């Protein structure tokens, strides 16, 4: 709810280059945005639309700069016999970064067999650590053709573990059974040899070829990491969307020996259960939870008709090994809710991690929608706390706002994690920054709350006639986490006998008026600021309503303009918290 | 009850319940009518906007083979206005009957993958054989032809020069280069023309076993003028394949990430021109278009695919599955069986603005027995009538009316439904500054003064 939508950062690339098909962060003491543009033309000799990954600077000016992973054209196997085909290889179709490492891949990279003259899409990746850049093509082996790893398209999906191991997905291996390949980043760079096109890594973990019944399953279509057997080692989660006769499945493998741990299964044919997966602890128990997207899921309405709205399953990992699974349905028809699922970290810093789910083809004019969901003790809050809208109309591809996104990185040192959203159909990427969250404890006391009309204590200035009076005291205290100012300026309103066109039975002593405005400067972290005030009852003869309770209403708001930071990022009040409170007083009978 | 509401406005009285009534007299005024007349209310002043139906066009169901097509009536009634009080439901009695003799359109959509070579030799004279049998069951039978293989892109297809020119160059065997979907023959009465088209077909090939049928199905359903679907006739789309199907985002492997638009993309050559541009359609997209174009989908698939396509068919209204032999020897019997199957099945479908609306169905099939939560009838002799009780309810008072269509699946005849909400009173049609409320200190409406007058 605290994402800044007024002035988000808009990055753009060459038109038709699908700038924003894949996004991530880069944190080496400077900060950067990583954007994939798999259809981007490069200066590589003879290579048309090889694709590139751009490093965009967030600081000051908005400049994306291409990262040179590979400047060379097609290597030759022999004289007049090209070894590879880098044209239209979709390099930058998937980008993943960890500290000083940047991993980008080309899923549609094809290469020549070293036996005969073929053109097999084994896929290839480039890994860049600081200065050294190496190639990584684990499917480019002696196991050729569709029966082997020839059509693997390695790097279709990728991820890092917490112990610097790479997880790579290849949906085409073994007649499209798919495959997960995992290598330690140290062996990838160390065993790298530019004269060897099929490099053997000693510590490699890989799924093996299975029976023919498992063909056309697309394992490795999407990937995610997290611990699921409590041994500290990130385990491998992967969507297998065509498995179980297009019911779709999700496989979990142990991250030490590639042994099978757990399975999830779709509940509808061709819903593409497993299109996207994510793993993050959503209920603050330090047990990673599984999020599985099924964008083509059809739900029945009150009218009984099917409608394609998409579905995400939320599976909470119990200590008992099981999963407590719930399901979250999309909101718009054909919007394909659940196409992308991004863990946000603790977006609002309330102690529970949050997550974003996109419907890239929703909203007016198919401009894309992103939904923000907050975690809590009982799991994920099913109702979104913020709706992110695409602003850019379509010309041929739809905009696909939300088709890729990345969160969980505090790029502005504001104490809150921010969010990148890609929209490749309009060649754009957008950075949404999280606003600081102010928790306010407001108070309102009315004493005495039972009013004797016959008492008349407080004298009123100018008349000898005394009136029945009581005290109205309102308190204000605030604090927040991260970077927010110290001094918070509040504007507070009080209205007596609020639910009264009808006559006001209670007025403030000094103003003789039912309404009172007051500016209140409070300090974050600091003690509670109060102001007491005297109100009085009208004379008994002035009104016929004695039964109805006189409600004292207190409303407060903040100066967002003045609380802003040097970057213009204005704080926001915490949600669930009332920007007003009410207390009622009664007249004696 | 209807009391304790608030008795503020007659309009708000109707909101708390469909059984509630208001007495707009100065003679908790909101209460049930049985109570109101006895409490001391008047006959002409009790305002009850009760839910009701108004039959507009209710022609009796025609039966017994009619030569004049415009006299054919297969659903009754045909036009209705449904005035619904919010909360007060209403049950519609819909009757459906199939006519003996009725035009049938058949579009033969065949997989032309390398596994389908032996099938082709047997279908060389399917046309004359199919139209000969169908001539008995209907007087207007029309057949058309289309073929498919796969999106001609990597990785679904090998992309070396030799493999592109001949994708069976590895066997070595002669096949045509892979193509997405070709619409060869527009629906015609000439069955002999269909035969000749088959003998000229040539087999393709590709790599992966599932194929790009859904691309073809979508195009066949949507392209009405090109394919030649008659307006008031059964639209039969026979899908012949021995393989699974690609759907949706399978094309991401090929770098195709723009969703299917469900539009017609048949060029000057009647070929699908977006085969390499758009994604495979989704089941939800196919359902949407098949229903809109009233196309009944028949899955003639081999044993290994039967169970898979059965599950698909359960999501697609009007869809059925026939067990095709390895050499397609039984395609005649499958088509006839399927036709006769739809010829006895009656499914209701509810189209239009039905979102946020409560709908329930009970089916009165065969002997008279009632099926709860069902809008489908089976085992019916052609001529037998199927009656359905469609219960419609508006949950909350709406602003504008709803256009709804109830129709049998596959048949052209339909039941138009104009559902208009009634949430307002007659009394609110209000005297501003009336002399009834102390020299015009307030307005008078619904028996109550809105400034208990300002005296």
């Amino acid at each position: 709810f605290n994402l800044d939508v007024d002035s988000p950062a808009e990055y753009s690339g060459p038109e038709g280059s699908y700038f924003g098909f894949a996004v991530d962060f880069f944190v080496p003491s400077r900060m950067f945005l990583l954007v994939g543009a798999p259809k981007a033309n490069t200066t590589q000799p003879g290579i048309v639309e090889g694709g590139q990954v751009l490093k965009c600077d967030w600081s000051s000016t908005r400049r994306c700069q291409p990262i040179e992973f590979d400047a060379t054209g097609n290597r030759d196997y022999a004289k007049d016999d090209p070894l590879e085909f880098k044209s239209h290889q979709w390099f930058g179709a998937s980008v993943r970064s960890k500290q000083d490492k940047i991993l980008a891949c080309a899923p549609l990279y094809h290469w020549r067999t070293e036996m005969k003259q073929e053109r097999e899409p084994v896929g290839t990746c480039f890994l860049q650590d600081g200065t050294k850049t190496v190639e990584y093509a684990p499917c480019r082996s002696q196991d050729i053709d569709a029966d082997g790893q020839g059509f693997c398209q390695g790097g279709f999906s990728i991820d890092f573990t917490k112990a610097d191991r790479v997880l790579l997905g290849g949906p085409g291996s073994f007649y499209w059974q798919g495959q997960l390949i995992s290598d330690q980043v140290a062996e990838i760079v160390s065993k790298y040899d530019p004269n060897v096109y099929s490099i053997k890594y000693n510590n490699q973990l890989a799924t093996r070829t299975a029976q023919a019944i498992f063909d056309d399953s697309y394992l490795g279509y999407s990937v995610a990491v997290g611990d699921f057997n409590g041994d500290g080692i990130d385990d491998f989660v992967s969507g297998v969307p065509r498995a179980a006769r297009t019911l779709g499945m999700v496989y979990i493998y142990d991250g030490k020996n590639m042994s099978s741990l757990y399975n999830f299964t779709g509940e509808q044919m061709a819903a593409y259960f497993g299109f996207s997966v994510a793993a993050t602890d959503i209920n603050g128990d330090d047990y990673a939870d599984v999020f599985i997207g099924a964008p083509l899921f059809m739900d029945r309405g009150s009218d009984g008709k099917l409608q394609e709205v998409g579905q995400v399953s939320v599976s909470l990992q119990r200590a008992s090994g099981d999963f407590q699974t719930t399901k979250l349905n999309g909101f718009e028809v054909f919007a394909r809710f659940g196409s992308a699922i991004a863990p946000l970290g603790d977006l609002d810093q309330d102690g529970f991690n949050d997550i974003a789910i996109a419907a890239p083809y929703g909203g007016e004019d198919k401009k894309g929608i992103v939904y923000i969901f907050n975690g809590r003790s009982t799991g994920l809050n099913a109702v979104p706390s913020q709706i992110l809208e695409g602003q850019w109309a379509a010309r041929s591809c739809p905009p696909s706002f939300g088709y890729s996104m990345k969160g969980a990185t505090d790029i502005d040192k504001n104490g809150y994690p921010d969010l990148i959203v890609g929209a490749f159909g309009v060649d754009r990427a957008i950075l949404y920054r999280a606003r600081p969250v102010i928790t306010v404890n407001a108070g309102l006391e009315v004493y005495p709350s039972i009013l004797n009309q016959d008492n008349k204590t407080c004298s009123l200035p100018g008349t000898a006639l005394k009136v029945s009076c009581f005290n109205v005291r309102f308190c204000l205290k605030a604090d927040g986490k991260g970077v927010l100012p110290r001094k918070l300026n509040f504007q507070v309103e009080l209205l007596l006998d609020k639910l009264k066109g009808a006559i006001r039975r209670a007025l403030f002593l000094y103003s003789r008026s039912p309404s009172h405005s007051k500016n209140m400067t409070i300090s974050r972290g600091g003690l509670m600021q109060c102001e007491e005030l005297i109100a009085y009852l009208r004379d008994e003869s002035e009104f016929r309503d004695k039964l109805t309770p006189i409600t004292i209403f207190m409303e407060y708001r903040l100066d967002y303009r003045t609380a802003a930071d040097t970057t213009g990022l204005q704080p926001i009040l915490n949600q669930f918290t009332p920007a007003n409170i009410s207390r009622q007083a009664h007249i004696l009978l | 009850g209807c009391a304790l509401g608030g008795a503020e406005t007659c309009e708000d009285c109707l909101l708390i319940g469909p059984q509630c009534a208001w007495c707009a007299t100065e003679n908790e005024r909101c209460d049930t009518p049985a109570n109101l007349l006895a409490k001391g209310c008047q006959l002409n002043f009790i305002e009850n906007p009760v839910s009701q139906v108004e039959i507009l066009k209710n022609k009796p169901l025609s039966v017994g083979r009619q030569k004049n097509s415009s006299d054919i009536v297969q659903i009754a009634p045909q036009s209705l206005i449904l005035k619904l009080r919010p909360g007060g439901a209403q049950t519609l009695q819909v009757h459906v009957r199939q006519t003996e003799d009725y035009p049938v359109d058949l579009y033969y959509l065949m997989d032309l993958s390398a596994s389908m070579d032996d099938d082709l030799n047997t279908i060389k004279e399917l046309g004359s054989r199919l139209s000969k049998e169908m001539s008995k069951l209907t007087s207007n039978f029309r057949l058309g032809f289309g073929s498919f293989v796969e999106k001609p892109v990597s990785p679904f297809v090998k992309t070396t020069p030799e493999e592109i020119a001949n994708p069976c160059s590895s066997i070595p065997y002669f096949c045509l280069p892979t193509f997405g979907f070709k619409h060869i023959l527009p629906l015609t009465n000439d069955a002999e023309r269909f035969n000749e088209i088959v003998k000229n077909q040539k087999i393709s090939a590709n790599i992966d076993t599932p194929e790009g049928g859904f691309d073809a199905i979508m195009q066949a359903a949507v392209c009405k003028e090109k394919i030649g679907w008659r307006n008031d006739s059964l639209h039969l789309l026979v899908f012949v394949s021995d393989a699974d199907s690609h759907f949706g985002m399978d094309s991401k492997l090929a770098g195709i990430v723009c969703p299917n638009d469900g539009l017609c993309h048949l060029d000057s050559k009647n070929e699908y021109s977006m085969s390499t541009v758009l994604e495979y359609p989704t089941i939800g997209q196919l359902i949407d278009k098949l229903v809109q174009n009233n196309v009944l989908l028949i899955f003639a698939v081999t044993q290994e695919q039967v169970h898979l396509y059965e599950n698909y068919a359960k999501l697609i209204p009007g869809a059925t599955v026939g067990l095709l032999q390895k050499d397609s020897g039984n395609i005649l019997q499958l088509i006839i069986s399927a036709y006769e199957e739809l010829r006895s099945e009656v499914e209701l479908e509810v189209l239009g603005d039905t979102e946020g609306l409560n709908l329930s169905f009970t089916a009165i099939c065969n002997n008279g027995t009632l099926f709860q939560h069902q809008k489908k009838c089976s085992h019916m002799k052609v001529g037998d009538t199927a009656s359905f009780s469609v219960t419609v309810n508006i949950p909350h008072c709406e602003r504008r009316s709803r256009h709804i269509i109830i129709k049998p699946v596959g048949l052209g005849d339909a039941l138009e439904l104009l559902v208009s909400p009634e949430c307002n009173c007659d009394c609110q049609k209000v005297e501003v500054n009336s002399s009834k409320c102390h020299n015009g200190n307030g307005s008078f409406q619904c028996g109550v003064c809105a400034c208990p007058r300002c005296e």
């Binding site: 569709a146 | 596994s115 070579d117 069976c168 065997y173 290994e304």
Partner: peptide, 11 residues
């Protein structure tokens, strides 16, 4: 009946 679209012809 075989592995791939060329299964029958390969056999």
């Amino acid at each position: 009946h075989g592995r791939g679209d060329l299964g029958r012809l390969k056999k």
